[PDB]
Design a protein around this ligand. Structure first.
Ligand SMILES: [Mn+2]
Ligand SMILES: [Mn+2]
Ligand SMILES: [Zn+2]
Ligand SMILES: [Zn+2]
Lengths: 611, 60, 369
DNA sequence: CTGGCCTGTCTTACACAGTGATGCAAATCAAGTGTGAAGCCAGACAAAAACC
DNA sequence: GGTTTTTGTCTGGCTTCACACTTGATTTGCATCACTGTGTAAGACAGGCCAG
DNA sequence: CACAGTGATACAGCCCTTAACAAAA
DNA sequence: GCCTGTCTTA
DNA sequence: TTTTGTTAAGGGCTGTATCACTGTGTAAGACAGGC
């Protein structure tokens, strides 16, 4: 074979073709034997389907250098959870074996971290924020905010770290600079324009359940994560507000920028308020000022709108002074009781507010009309503690479906048992009704039975097909008509709470939602009297009573869902194991800085480069 | 990268040392330049260096 | 390429009860153990390599080191004369493995310790491992989720590997390296067994026994009185026959006479080990003895035969305090290597003599150290 | 009917694995260019070698 | 033996890098820090067989 | 439960490969 | 006409 | 006169979209003490 033999030999075996090629080059290509042989070999390589070696030859002939910028190295390190030691091994190995420095060393990545972390860029607030420092070089700060720790004081059992809220807002904005400029471009606006931008910031807070690592005698360790999500940025260009940025995946863990991480129980009110109050204070202060910050060389100004929607009901109730979820006062939007909400199905309005709730706590505290505890509690509608966070409670598209399906399932079981006709039934009769329904759904609808309510059972059960199925088990067909119309009203309502923008996607559904929920409740009250027990769920109450008001308040439902942060805990634990110094004070800030970096849109752009 | 103060100095003083001695080697020319510049007055070189430095810093 | 089962090889003569197929890789560690509900309940999952197939893969891994070592000994690359491979064989349980109930694991592994080639009638070494006790060269052979004290399961899983190793103990391996067929013969040395696992696999009693040594037949009393004149006596075959003696009771003796006859071998052995010692444990045992001697020389125990617990406790406290003052030695509840290392010095002996009245005993302590 | 005394659980000591940060020594870069070292060219042709 | 190959031989004049030397401000290499959780195993200990 | 996240696996999409016209330049 | 952790699984 | 596109049928690498599969977090109910 040619490649077995030596250069003198291969030259011997190829001399004839070499002479022919020199002739071809001089007669057609001006004597470039080098270029002609290169092209011949590249095209031969492409012919044998070996594109890899051909492209590598192309890159080495072009001399185009392969060097990853330290920011890309950081992107990979962060997004694959490599520790410093592991990254260093990979770096030194690739550099030693290819001779080229494809990955950058660790100090370069640290320096690139500095840009993407709070405390790097300068900024100004006009007018300066009330009770907030004007220093711009603040990074990670102790989450206790100088909380007293002497042995005399209350015992401090938690470790927490946080960013300064304005500083974190600056870091997040600078991170999305490229998307802001590209969004202005895509809206036919100018890169250099600086007119006032408005930032709609979604605020969130949740407990992360258990965080313990354990070798049994598991001592639990709970955590609280205080976060914010830039939802949209608009620019005033006229009497018009042009949407230059809108978060594509608003419930993702990718854009949920961690602001404060603490090892404490969300039910531990003393510590919750001690850690969170300084954040709330900076947030308040920013509500009354404009941020000037240099982007692409042009100073810009930003006005903020904080909307605390990332709070599940338990945390809403805790921070807004309300009673625990088992209370008679079931809604965090109005003053209805469970009985009231069960009898009055559709006509309620969003009457609670942070101010009213502050007021009601003061009424509770001072007892100004010298009332008994039952009368006082009635007066203040269950606001028996002082609220300390203004929230905007909502509902997720999931729970609307869930509540409706629970009700329809119970209706199916009772309509199989003809309770419209027989008031009483033993436990055995109802159990056989449910067995009949579950068997028939498994047979005709391929629906597994479930012992516990859940989302996709609801999704698959709330179909007209299932109504035909269950009607195959009902004697009277007037009740067939009733069930078909009830499910028709359900299907006329569902698009409003599921769509991403109901104002645009299903304007007739949104316009007729209130009329349809009225007819829904009227059908339940006339042709379904039996299913009234004075009981109802917050999910059903909110679905029938507050969906149109919540849409008009927020524009949508499905996007302010409670769905994503179930990944957070996992994320947290990972960072604590593989990327954190093993010391209580440092591990927290290492988790914080790694979580910050994991959320930066810059590095995520590098990690989606192929598209 | 922007050149050190000494480096821009060296580029400006190449013709002087070259005109006086034409066959001086790179080792010799640089040894001289470094020796006589080391013995030195040289503040405007450091100024130009700082200016070019921050100019390059701005370049992204 | 780097996993067992890729290269071809031959055993001459063919291995007894081992398949000749060479494309075998990961195989079920249960080795066809019955799993029906009638049979004994199998609570374990394990996976293994076939021992010969693993040996092949390990040699091919180090091919480059073997050839370069042959060069470094001024020998020819193409030589194929019988290579002898020394193989340290090792076994340990790995404690709790669970990710979160305890889940225990056993690891049966081997280490290529030395490869010699024969030129004329010199055995020139061509390779030997620089770090024998590193996790890096400890090639895993079988991994199982079982307790090392679960004797039934342990034997059931490990017996097929021991069969394969027994088979290779009398056969030659033909294996192609760098185009040339080479020939290897192996020496297996099961020295990687801590004492508990030695005693378990060699049929001996548990560590609290009177038969304290796994090299010899001494009792705790004997070894305490005689101390130094003892020799390595025990072997796997002697232990198999002592088990048979226990089992058969040929001279119709009582259980105590029988136990004295078999010197602790009450169970049947099933692994041939090479029980050794750790340099760490030599230091620790010596240091423990020296610690007791120091505290007793401080209390002068020869003059107080009926000394109570609390007097000896104050002697120990005196020694701890003075060692902290002079040698900066934090008193210890348990013994470890660093303590032994810092305590076993001549200057420490001077420090402790500073608390001993009689200088005639200074002479003795210093000579002992 | 109650010890001493020969045995498997219990209880922490204790080394250390390995985290992101750190800190100091040593490459490294960047410019000038004239060298020297190095594999290659061409053509008629014969050694040391395997193929019928 | 003929018929096929590998692999040398002799020059120079070529082209393409590496080295040469300096300065000092960056960039890399590398060992180290402080620090706890976790495994491992050295202890202690209650316990129950059996005898006075 | 739902889903995250593992290594293995199945499937789709990739740029071509024969001749010829020919459109942009 | 109860409240509220703990526990069990889905 | 010099560069590319293009047709049709069809052949390999490569990229990602699943497989199957279990641990695990979260939460939905069950249930029991308030001696
Ligand atoms: Mn929650
Ligand atoms: Mn062990
Ligand atoms: Zn309401
Ligand atoms: Zn012995």
């Amino acid at each position: 074979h040619l490649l077995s033999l030596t250069r003198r030999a291969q030259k011997h075996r190829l001399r004839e073709l070499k002479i022919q090629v020199k002739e071809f080059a001089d007669k057609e290509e001006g004597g470039d034997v080098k270029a002609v042989c290169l092209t011949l070999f590249l095209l031969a390589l492409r012919a044998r389907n070996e594109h890899r070696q051909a492209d590598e030859l192309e890159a080495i002939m072009q001399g185009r250098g392969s060097g990853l910028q330290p920011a890309v190295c950081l992107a990979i390190r962060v997004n694959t959870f490599l520790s410093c030691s592991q990254y260093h091994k990979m770096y030194r190995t690739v550099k030693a074996i290819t001779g080229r420095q494809i990955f950058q060393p660790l100090h370069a990545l640290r320096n690139a971290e500095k840009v993407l972390l709070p405390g790097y860029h300068p900024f100004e607030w006009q007018p300066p924020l009330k009770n907030v420092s004007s220093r711009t070089d603040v990074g990670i700060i102790d989450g206790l905010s100088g909380l007293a720790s002497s042995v005399d004081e209350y015992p401090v059992d938690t470790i927490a770290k946080r960013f300064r809220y304005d500083s974190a807002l600056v870091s997040a904005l600078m991170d999305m600079e490229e998307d802001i400029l590209e969004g202005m471009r895509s809206q036919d606006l100018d890169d250099y324009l600086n007119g006032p931008f408005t930032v709609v910031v979604k605020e969130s807070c949740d407990g992360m359940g258990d965080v313990s690592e354990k070798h049994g005698p598991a001592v639990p360790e709970k955590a609280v994560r205080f976060s914010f999500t830039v939802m949209r940025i608009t620019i005033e260009h006229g009497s018009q507000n042009v949407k230059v940025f809108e978060e594509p995946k608003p419930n993702s863990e990718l854009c949920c920028k961690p602001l404060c991480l603490m090892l404490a129980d969300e039910s531990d009110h003393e510590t919750l308020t001690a850690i969170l109050s300084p954040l709330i204070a900076e947030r308040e202060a920013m509500k009354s000022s404009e941020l000037t910050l240099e982007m692409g060389g042009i100073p810009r100004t930003f006005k903020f709108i904080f909307r605390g929607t990332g709070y599940d009901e338990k945390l809403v109730r805790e921070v807004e002074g309300l009673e625990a979820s088992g209370s008679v006062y079931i809604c965090t939007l109005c003053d209805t009781t469970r009985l009231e909400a069960s009898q009055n199905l559709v006509f309620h309005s969003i009457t609670r507010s942070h101010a009213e709730n502050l007021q009601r706590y003061e009424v509770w505290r001072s007892n100004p009309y010298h009332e008994s505890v039952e009368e006082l509690r009635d007066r203040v509608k269950g606001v028996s503690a002082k609220p300390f966070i203004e929230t905007v409670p909502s509902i997720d598209a999931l729970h609307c479906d869930i509540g409706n399906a629970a009700e329809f399932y119970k209706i199916f079981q009772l309509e199989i048992g003809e309770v419209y006709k027989h008031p009483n039934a033993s436990k055995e009769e109802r159990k056989r009704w449910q067995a009949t329904l579950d068997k028939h759904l498994r047979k005709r609808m391929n629906l597994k039975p479930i012992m516990r309510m859940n989302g996709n059972f609801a999704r698959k059960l709330m179909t007209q097909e299932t109504v035909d199925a269950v009607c195959e088990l009902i004697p009277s067909e007037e009740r067939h008509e009733a069930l078909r119309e009830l499910m028709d009203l359900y299907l006329k309502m569902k698009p409003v709470w599921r769509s991403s923008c109901p104002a645009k996607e299903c304007p007739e559904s949104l316009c007729q939602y209130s009329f349809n929920s009225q007819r829904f409740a009227e059908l339940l009250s006339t042709k379904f009297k039996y299913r009234y027990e004075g009981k109802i769920t917050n999910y059903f109450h909110k679905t029938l009573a507050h969906v149109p008001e919540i849409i008009e308040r927020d524009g949508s439902i499905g996007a302010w869902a409670s769905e994503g942060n179930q990944s957070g805990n996992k994320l947290f634990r990972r960072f604590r194991k593989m990327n954190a110094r093993q010391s209580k004070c440092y591990e927290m800030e290492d988790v914080l800085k790694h979580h910050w970096l994991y959320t930066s849109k810059y590095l995520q752009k590098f990690m989606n480069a192929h598209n | 990268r922007p050149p050190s103060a000494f480096f821009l100095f060296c580029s400006e003083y190449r013709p002087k040392i070259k005109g006086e001695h034409p066959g001086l080697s790179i080792g010799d020319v640089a040894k001289k330049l470094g020796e006589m510049w080391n013995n030195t007055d040289k503040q405007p070189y450091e100024k130009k260096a700082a200016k070019l430095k921050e100019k390059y810093e701005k370049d992204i």
